[PDB]
């Protein structure tokens, strides 16, 4: 961890200073997550019917809610009752597709296998996402957290040195992939970088990346999600043009990604929260209990979402189940207290993610603003090209 | 847990003996999964 | 009794076609 | 209640001891329930008979003429061939006989898929697999154990010696070496031993016979441990230690005295012995047998160690695996006795170069390869459950519908 | 039809 040993003035003013509530001490080294899947009581596994058909149904419930109010006023209604059906349908289908991602990791009803592959499959088609990659996609985040150039599946920093070479290469600030990155890292639309992420798995729809023994099942994967964009998604425009397709569709989806990026970019970054290379000091355990950040929320929200919050847990013991994922939180809370780091959703902690921690440097090891970084790292072109004087 | 040391015994076994970016992961997982 | 002289038996015709069949391949297949 | 920065490693630690202990003693469970069958296996094989041949090809044929293709299990194989092919036969003690069966028939039974031969240009090309001393040039092409008779007392050359050596690689032994000797005043040497892999954390495997006019004059068998504290595993231990509650009972504990030069390489649990009759010498060759055999059978499974970048823990257990097999070898050179019954004989340019290149050499930097050849249980396991080609099943529904109407 | 080796059972 980056803040080590210190009084808890420090960590506390570093606390309210960028939103979090309680920071992280330090973990000592050479351990594993799958350790502290011992101090979990063994009641935790239990599978119950309960609090699946709730957790299935409650989002379903809001959704067709959204639904049966958006049509009976198709529109004749003005854009804010547009966008609160809007954010109302796209929470539900987060809920929905946090089930869909159980089911993906075999950990909903692992009784009955060929109805939980159905339903993620199902579950995850409108979004246009596939199964079998989604789970592979997942594993390998799971297996490389926090490690640099390697954790491409996750949010990944844009490090002060690939900039500079870039900067290099492209003769100044005015290149293409500069405005690029300037617009994507510095105005609020990074709270839908998630859709990038959307459009790199597909990997080229290249089946030469895949093991051979499994090419049937990877293009079952894909077949199910254009299925849909070629069943579904004729439907709904023909029924109802443009606009019956910007309301129906495109904006419970913009308001998918928002909470799917939201969730991931505030899990796993924070200022305190180091990137280190492979060999140089990258642990395993260290990463994935030190360098998690837990997202608190309203409990409507939450229970709206089926605790798709809470990663903590799901990562020490990954066979535990979804419903049990509060609870197991406030036993680890007691014993790994100390270490763990916590906040709150709200208005500074996103405005601090898009105006303060854009680049990350190795040096100081931190996030530091684009302009300024780019600016000092300017400077230093022209000093360099005064060292350059022969 | 195993997977980063399994990931060294084959490189070490490159030796003796006398894209594709997912086929590993592919195979240890149908190896440790199905048995 | 009859056991070593089974084996006895059992050996001579095991070596037989082994060595036949050695210097077949060999000489087919590696002199060359 | 909270943890502390410490008692996480407690826990590490307590966790990879837990593991380590749960694999070591599956490793034994299977020894531990009947010991005796670790020598008892091919009077079993015996028993059962021999075994009839069930593949199309040969129930056709015997039911075309009448021949019945019987078959044999490997321990019933290898103890028919016997001490098979070695040119030196027929001047062997039947003991030395009876052991170097039994060692080199489990090495090709168990390690079937793996053995090859050690390479060629190392050992065979100059000469060391057939060695004699009246002729230390090989001007008749080795076979002067036939073409030069040998010398009486007094003359040029009394006594005699003959050497014959075979080598073997595998995947996890880098070598595996039995060689014997033979003196004219009539003395007799066997000598085997087997190295792992420097990859590989497992203890050297050794014996030693030396026997004098017919009788066994010294008898040495030992698991010599590899690392820096002389430890072994905790199941090669608890291995040994059955095996000689289980076969050398009943026989002298105060014999087993520890020769000074092995004080510095050999385990706790090492047997020499000069045996007095016939019952210890039968005791320790079914104890010999048994320990072998068991040892290569927890070899089967066995993983090596790598070093990962960053981790120094294996960076030292390699260390310390170079280390104990270079000290083994450093020890054993000094064992003056092999050394001046070879040296008074042929030389000493011709003795220290065969000792160093062949029985204790050490080079980190190069081990042999292997050729693994697991496929053919394919091919073997098909012939005995073949699969008939989509014109064959209507043939046999017609002959079940039609022989079913009884 | 005769043994002529050595084992360890007479
Ligand atoms: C719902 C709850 C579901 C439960 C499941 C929760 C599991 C959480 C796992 C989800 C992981 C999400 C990762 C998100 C992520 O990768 O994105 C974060 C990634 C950033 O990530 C980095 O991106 C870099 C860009 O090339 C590189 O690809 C790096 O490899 C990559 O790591 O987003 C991007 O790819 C940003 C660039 C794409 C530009 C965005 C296009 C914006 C278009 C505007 C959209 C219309 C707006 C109106
Ligand atoms: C059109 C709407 C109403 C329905 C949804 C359509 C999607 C199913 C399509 C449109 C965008 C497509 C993607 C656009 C970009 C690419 C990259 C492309 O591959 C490459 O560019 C490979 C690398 C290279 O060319 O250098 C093909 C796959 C993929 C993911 C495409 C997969 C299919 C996607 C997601």
């Known amino acids: 961890t980056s803040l080590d040993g210190l009084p808890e003035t420090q960590k506390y003013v570093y606390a309210d200073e960028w939103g979090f509530s309680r920071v992280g001490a330090d973990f000592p080294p050479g351990s594993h997550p799958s350790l502290f899947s011992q101090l979990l009581p063994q009641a935790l596994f239990a599978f119950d019917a309960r609090a699946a058909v709730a957790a299935v149904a409650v989002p379903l419930a809001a959704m067709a809610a959204g639904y049966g109010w958006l049509w009976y006023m198709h529109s004749i209604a003005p854009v804010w009752q547009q966008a609160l059906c809007a954010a109302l349908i796209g929470t539900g289908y987060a809920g929905l597709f946090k089930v869909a991602h159980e089911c993906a990791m075999m950990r909903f009803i692992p009784q009955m296998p060929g109805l939980q592959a159905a339903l993620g499959t199902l579950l995850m088609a409108p979004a246009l996402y596939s199964l079998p990659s989604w789970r592979l996609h997942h594993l390998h985040h799971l297996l490389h957290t926090n490690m640099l150039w390697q954790d491409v599946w996750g949010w990944h920093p844009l490090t002060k040195v690939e900039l500079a070479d870039e900067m290099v290469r492209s003769g100044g600030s005015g290149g293409a992939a500069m405005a690029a990155a300037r617009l994507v890292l510095t105005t609020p639309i990074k709270l839908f970088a998630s859709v990038g992420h959307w459009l790199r798995s597909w990997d080229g729809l290249d089946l030469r990346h895949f093991h051979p023994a499994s090419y049937v099942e990877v293009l079952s994967g894909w077949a199910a999600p254009l299925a849909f964009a070629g069943l579904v998604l004729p439907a709904v425009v023909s029924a109802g043009g443009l606009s019956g397709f910007v309301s129906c569709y495109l904006a419970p989806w913009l308001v998918f990604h928002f909470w799917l990026s939201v969730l991931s970019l505030t899990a796993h970054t924070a200022p305190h929260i180091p990137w280190r290379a492979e060999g140089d000091g990258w642990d395993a355990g260290r990463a994935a209990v030190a360098g998690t950040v837990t997202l608190r929320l309203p409990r409507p929200l939450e229970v709206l979402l089926n605790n798709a919050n809470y990663m903590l847990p799901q990562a020490v013991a990954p066979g535990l189940p979804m419903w049990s994922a509060p609870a197991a939180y406030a036993v680890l809370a007691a014993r790994l207290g100390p270490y763990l780091t916590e906040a709150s959703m709200s208005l500074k902690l996103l405005t601090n993610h898009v105006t303060r921690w854009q680049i990350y440097d190795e040096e100081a090891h931190t996030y530091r603003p684009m302009e300024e970084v780019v600016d000092e790292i300017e400077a230093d072109l022209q000093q360099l090209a005064a060292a350059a004087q022969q | 847990k195993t997977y980063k040391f399994e990931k060294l015994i084959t490189n070490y076994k490159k030796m003796q003996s006398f894209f594709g970016t997912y086929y590993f992961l592919q195979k240890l997982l149908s190896k440790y999964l199905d048995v | ?32 | 209640s909270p943890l502390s920065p410490e008692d996480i490693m407690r826990l590490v630690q307590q966790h990879e001891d837990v593991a380590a202990a749960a694999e070591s003693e599956q490793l034994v469970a299977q020894f531990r329930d009947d010991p005796q069958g670790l020598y008892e296996y091919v009077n079993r094989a015996y028993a059962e008979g021999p075994r009839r041949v069930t593949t199309p090809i040969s129930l056709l044929q015997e039911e075309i003429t009448g021949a019945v293709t019987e078959s044999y299990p490997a321990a019933v194989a290898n103890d028919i061939i016997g001490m098979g092919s070695w040119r030196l036969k027929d001047d062997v003690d039947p003991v030395i006989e009876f052991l170097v069966a039994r060692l080199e028939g489990c090495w090709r039974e168990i390690l079937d898929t793996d053995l090859c031969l050690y390479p060629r240009e190392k050992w065979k090309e100059q000469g060391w697999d057939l060695v004699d001393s009246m002729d230390p040039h090989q001007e008749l092409e080795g076979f002067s154990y036939a073409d030069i008779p040998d010398p009486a007392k007094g003359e040029a050359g009394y006594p005699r010696l003959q050497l014959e050596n075979r080598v073997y690689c595998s995947k996890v032994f880098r070598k595996l070496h039995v060689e014997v000797g033979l003196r004219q005043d009539g003395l007799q040497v066997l000598h085997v031993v087997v190295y792992p892999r420097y990859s590989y954390d497992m203890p050297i495997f050794g014996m030693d016979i030396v026997m004098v006019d017919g009788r066994v004059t010294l008898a040495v068998v030992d698991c010599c441990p590899v690392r820096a504290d002389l430890k072994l595993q905790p199941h090669y231990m608890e291995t040994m230690a059955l095996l000689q509650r289980t076969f050398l009972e009943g026989t002298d504990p105060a014999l087993r005295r520890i020769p000074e030069w092995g004080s510095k390489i050999f385990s706790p649990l090492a047997l020499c012995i000069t045996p007095s009759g016939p019952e210890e010498l039968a005791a320790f060759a079914k104890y010999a047998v048994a320990l072998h055999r068991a040892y290569l059978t927890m070899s089967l499974n066995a993983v090596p160690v790598v070093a990962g970048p960053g981790d120094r823990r294996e960076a030292a257990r390699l260390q310390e695996i170079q280390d104990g097999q270079k000290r083994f070898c450093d020890n054993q050179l000094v064992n003056k006795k092999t050394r001046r019954v070879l040296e008074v004989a042929m030389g000493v340019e011709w003795t220290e170069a065969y000792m160093s290149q062949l029985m204790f050499d050490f080079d980190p930097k190069y081990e042999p390869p292997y050729f693994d050849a697991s496929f053919e249980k394919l091919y073997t396991y098909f012939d005995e459950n073949p699969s008939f080609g989509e014109m064959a099943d209507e043939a046999m529904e017609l002959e079940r519908g039609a022989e079913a109407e009884r | ?10």
């Open chain 5, 1 to 10: 039809t005769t043994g002529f080796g050595w084992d360890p059972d007479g």
């Open chain 3, 1 to 32: 009794k009859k056991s070593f002289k089974k084996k006895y038996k059992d050996k001579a015709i095991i070596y037989y076609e082994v060595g036949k069949f050695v210097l077949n391949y060999f000489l087919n297949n590696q002199l060359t």
